[PDB]
Amino acid sequence: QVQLVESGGGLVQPGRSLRLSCAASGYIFSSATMAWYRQAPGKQRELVASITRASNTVYADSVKGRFTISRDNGKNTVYLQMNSLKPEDTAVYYCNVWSRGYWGQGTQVTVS
Amino acid sequence: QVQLVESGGGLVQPGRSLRLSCAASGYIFSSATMAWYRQAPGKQRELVASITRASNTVYADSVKGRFTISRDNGKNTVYLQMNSLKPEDTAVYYCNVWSRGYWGQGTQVTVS
Amino acid sequence: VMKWKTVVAIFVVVVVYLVTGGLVFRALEQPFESSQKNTIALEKAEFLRDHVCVSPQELETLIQHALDADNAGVSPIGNSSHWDLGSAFFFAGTVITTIGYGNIAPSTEGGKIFCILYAIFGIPLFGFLLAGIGDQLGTIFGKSIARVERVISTILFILAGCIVFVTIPAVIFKYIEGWTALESIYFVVVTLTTVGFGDFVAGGNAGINYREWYKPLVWFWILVGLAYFAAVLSMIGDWLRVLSKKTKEE
Amino acid sequence: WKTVVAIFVVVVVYLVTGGLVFRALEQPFESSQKNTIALEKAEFLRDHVCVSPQELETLIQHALDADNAGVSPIGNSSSSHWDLGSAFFFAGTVITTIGYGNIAPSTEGGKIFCILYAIFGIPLFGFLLAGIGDQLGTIFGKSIARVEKVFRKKQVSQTKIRVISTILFILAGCIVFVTIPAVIFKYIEGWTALESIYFVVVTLTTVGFGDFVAGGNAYREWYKPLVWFWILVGLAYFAAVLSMIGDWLRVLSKKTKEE
Ligand SMILES: CC(C)CCC[C@@H](C)[C@H]1CC[C@H]2[C@@H]3CC=C4C[C@@H](OC(=O)CCC(=O)O)CC[C@]4(C)[C@H]3CC[C@]12C
Ligand SMILES: CC(C)CCC[C@@H](C)[C@H]1CC[C@H]2[C@@H]3CC=C4C[C@@H](OC(=O)CCC(=O)O)CC[C@]4(C)[C@H]3CC[C@]12C
Ligand SMILES: CC(C)CCC[C@@H](C)[C@H]1CC[C@H]2[C@@H]3CC=C4C[C@@H](OC(=O)CCC(=O)O)CC[C@]4(C)[C@H]3CC[C@]12C
Ligand SMILES: CC(C)CCC[C@@H](C)[C@H]1CC[C@H]2[C@@H]3CC=C4C[C@@H](OC(=O)CCC(=O)O)CC[C@]4(C)[C@H]3CC[C@]12C
Ligand SMILES: [Ba+2]
Ligand SMILES: [Ba+2]
Ligand SMILES: [Ba+2]
Ligand SMILES: [Ba+2]
């Protein structure tokens, strides 16, 4: 049973930093590619960041240079360091096992 | 000026073999990936076969084991050996420089 | 045996050779690399235009995911195992010959431990065989040179050896692998000098149905070709010592 | 020829033996990895209906073949691996015969130059590596002169003095050229203890697969030249150790031939 538990969301001030975490279980984490998505109220699911099995990172152009995805294979947790938050980042963030259909519950991050 | 001249199409009998060719010019052919597409009357453009710069071939599941794409870098020509033709292969075949927007005129292949 | 004064002088020569070589390699490759990196971006942009449902970050994640999986031992193409007894026997050869193309490499923890031990005893074990092959080739050349009977003999050894071990195999590689005359010569040199970049590997394309005798004949050519290149590189190493001794006196 | 054909059979046996061990260790894990990659591609095709399986396969193959041909399909780069810095280190892989393959000539002119570069560069480097080995042997000979003086007064047999000295040379050399650098590689590149040891062995034995390369992931200013200085002294140490193993096989074969 693949389970993805998220943490670190909530209401924050614009400009201030925030950190999301994702406790993964039920699968070989070391060889899988992790990813973070965001569901804006008036928009569709959008890929935010993705860290491959060899720790290589890929980011959305809107979050480039501000957000930083990092994996801790020892603790099976994928992080998303969201710095310099703009009101445009207000969305529900989901933790995903890229191209495997495994999704988390979703943590609401509100920037206002 | 990129030009792709096609040859070898036309009316053929079902089961019988047919060979399409594509004389390429106006670009570095050695490093480019060649591809063949087919426009069926009641369907959209469909990738048939594609040979990469390192001569690796990729085929559509409908033409697997029957069609064979091969490149002759010495003569700048990409071939499509269509064997055991079924009436389902009746379509306009286009020669393409995969992911470069360069297309040929299109040769009608009719199997009946 | 060798004094530190000579060692530090030889070290400066090698650093000069490396900086000089690097400058030639940069001038020969960087303009073409910039040209190739522009066409790859154009291809990715045209792919994104043709497939609207795929975002640039999704395409970039997919490309990175495919490259990292391929580098980790798992090919992201198809649904053709490179660890079958056939390819595994030839991989074991690249270890003991120190060619190490890298096309096939251990991914399992146990495979990495075994590969360390395999090279430790396998490389000196192969060195004994390569010394014997070189003596057998030298005895075969000595028997042919006796019929002809030193400067002319060394030029004949180099020329005839270049025909049977370099040109003849490269012609076969051009007619089989579809490589150009230059790419085939480049492959022969890189292979028989144990450099083994891995960019060109004989019997690597999945599309072409290779002959049964093809793969073992390439590995037999490697065995005799390594022994020939070791003799030629030793002659060049000896030539540099004679050239250095003549320049030291003058 | 009788000894040569006997040694050839030994090598073929060693190759078939090794090939069987490698297949048993890798094939089950390779089949497991090739199933999860297919599942990921299938789920990608479900999530992106506008992309056909043959188009996805063409894209993946196109990216792998472009990377293998010298052009990285990652990023836009307005990170060139042909700048003087990386070009100097590439030239090193040629003369040392390590040849990782991470960087390789793509131009016709670069392939012609690389052929000539190895022809004169490999024997030129061999002369330097011989001098480095003599300097390391002189440094070890100076250190062993103090240890052998303590063993001389302890009445240890003269033949056993050389036996203890060879074990000390191997042990001390394995510390400074194998363990110490691999610990640094683990703390810098993020490689595991086994992957770092595997890298050190593969590099210093001139095998150079290219799967593990120092300073490759997109480092400190002193890192890259210190890695290549370690290569220079480490190659000379590994040459001496592999020569000792080659000499021990000759002594072992001579003892077995008599008995
Ligand atoms: C798949 C392809 C690329 C393989 C390449 C073919 C090689 C395996 C061939 C090409 C030339 C051959 C060599 C050509 C000449 C000789 C000399 C020959 O010597 C004799 O028979 C002595 C003759 C005499 O002096 O009377 C021994 C085999 C050998 C080294 C041959 C060994 C096999 C070689 C290297
Ligand atoms: C493929 C391209 C890079 C051209 C290759 C040209 C070679 C034929 C050159 C490049 C460097 C040259 C060497 C540079 C330095 C020396 C030292 C020189 O000896 C001395 O000057 C004595 C003092 C010292 O040991 O340096 C003798 C010639 C030699 C081996 C040279 C021989 C000819 C070499 C190998
Ligand atoms: C980026 C990282 C991975 C680089 C790895 C570091 C190496 C460059 C270091 C690690 C251990 C070092 C060696 C440790 C010990 C010695 C003995 C030393 O000998 C003496 O100074 C003589 C002492 C005496 O006997 O009195 C000469 C340098 C050398 C070979 C060192 C050379 C540099 C080495 C190989
Ligand atoms: C990493 C794994 C594969 C274990 C490695 C074990 C090695 C220590 C073994 C593998 C093959 C062995 C060799 C196989 C054959 C011989 C020939 C033997 O000599 C003879 O029998 C004389 C006749 C002949 O030349 O074959 C002397 C031991 C030796 C070198 C063996 C020494 C020990 C070796 C290198
Ligand atoms: Ba390699
Ligand atoms: Ba090598
Ligand atoms: Ba590679
Ligand atoms: Ba005593």
**This structure's resolution (angstroms)?**
3.2
CB B109 within 8 A of CB B89: yes
Q: Output the domain CATH number for residue A90.
A: 2.60.40.10
Alpha-carbon distance A65 to nearest alpha carbon in chain C (angstroms): 14
Quote the CA–CA distance of D156 and D148 in Å, as a whole number.
9
Are the C-beta atoms of residues C18 and D93 closer than 8 Å to each other?
no
- Asked if residue D12 is part of any domain, the answer here is yes
Residue whose Cα lies nearest atom 13 of ligand 3: it is: D176
**Experiment used for this model:** X-ray
CA–CA distances in Å: residue C222 to residues C98, C99, C234, C235: 12, 10, 18, 20
| Beta-strand pair A3-7/A10-12 | unpaired
B79 and B72 Cβ atoms separated by less than 8 Å? yes
Q: Which chains touch C (3 or more CB pairs under 8 A)?
A: A, B, D
Identify whether D115 is part of a domain. yes
Specify whether the CB–CB gap between A92 and A107 falls below 8 A.
yes
Distances (CA, A) of B58 to B32, B64, D213: 15, 9, 31
Contact B1, B26 (CB under 8 A): yes
Q: Which amino acid is at D71?
A: V
Q: How far apart are CA C231 and CA D146, in angstroms?
A: 41
Q: Is the dihedral of CA C117, C120, C123, C125 positive or negative?
A: negative
Helix (H, G, I), strand (E, B) or coil at A107: strand
| CB pair distance less than 8 Å for B60 and D52 | yes
| Cβ contact D123:C236 at 8 Å | yes
- Domain, as residue range, for A98: 3-102+106-110
CA angle B15, B17, B22 (to 5 degrees): 145
How many whole angstroms separate alpha carbon B96 and alpha carbon B78? 10
Q: Note whether D18 and C118 are within 8 A (CB).
A: yes
Domains of chain A: total: 1
* Nearest-angstrom CA–CA distance, B91 and B106: 10
Helix H segments across A1-112? Answer: none
Please indicate, yes or no, if residue D8 is contained in any of the structural domains. Answer: yes
- C201 within 8 A of C186, measured Cβ to Cβ: no
What size, in residues, is chain B?
112
What is the domain extent for residue C159? 3-245
Q: Which two tokens stand for residue C82?
A: 């490179």
CB-CB under 8 Å, A56 with D217: yes
How many C-beta neighbours within 10 Å does residue B96 have? 22
Residue C250: inside a domain: no
Q: Any chain A CB within 8 A of the CB of D47?
A: yes
Distance between CA atoms of residues D76 and A79, nearest Å: 25
- Token duo for residue D195: 């992957």
DSSP string for residues in C36-86 = HHHHHHHHHHHHHHH-TTS-HHHHHHHHHHHHHHHHTT---S----TTSHH
Q: How many domains would you assign to chain C?
A: 1
Chain centroid to CA D145: 33
| Amino acid code (one letter) for D197 | I
- Which residue, among B67, B75, B74, has the nearest Cα to B35 in the 3D structure? B67
Rounded to an integer, what distance in angstroms lies between the CA atom of residue D66 and that of residue D83? 19
> Rounded CA gap, D1 and C137, in Å?
11
Instruction: Identify the CA nearest to A25 among candidates A77, A74, A95.
Output: A77
Mutate to test the interface with C, among A47, A62, A64 (most CBs of C within 10 A): A47
Q: Is any atom of ligand 2 closer than 6 Å to the C-beta of C23?
A: no
DSSP C167: I
Cα C211 to Cα C203: distance, rounded to the nearest angstrom: 10
d(CA D183, CA D193): 7
Give the CATH number of the domain where residue C150 resides. Answer: 1.10.287.70
Residues with CB under 6 A from ligand 1: C 140, 143-144, 164-165, 168-169, 172-173, 214, 217-218, 220-221, 224
Q: Does D61 reside within a domain?
A: yes
CA distance C104 to C73: 7
C194 is in an annotated binding site: yes
> Is the CB of residue A34 less than 8 Å from the CB of residue A78?
yes
Who contacts D35 (Cβ-Cβ below 8 Å, separation ≥6)?
none
DSSP-derived 3-state class of residue C242: helix
Q: Is residue C211 included in any domain, yes or no? A: yes
* A residues 30..59 contacting C (CB < 8 A): 31, 33, 35, 46-47, 50, 52-54, 56, 58-59
Contacts of C163 (CB under 8 A, 6+ apart): none
> Following CA atoms B82, B84, B90, B91 in sequence, which dihedral angle do they give, to the nearest 10 degrees?
-20
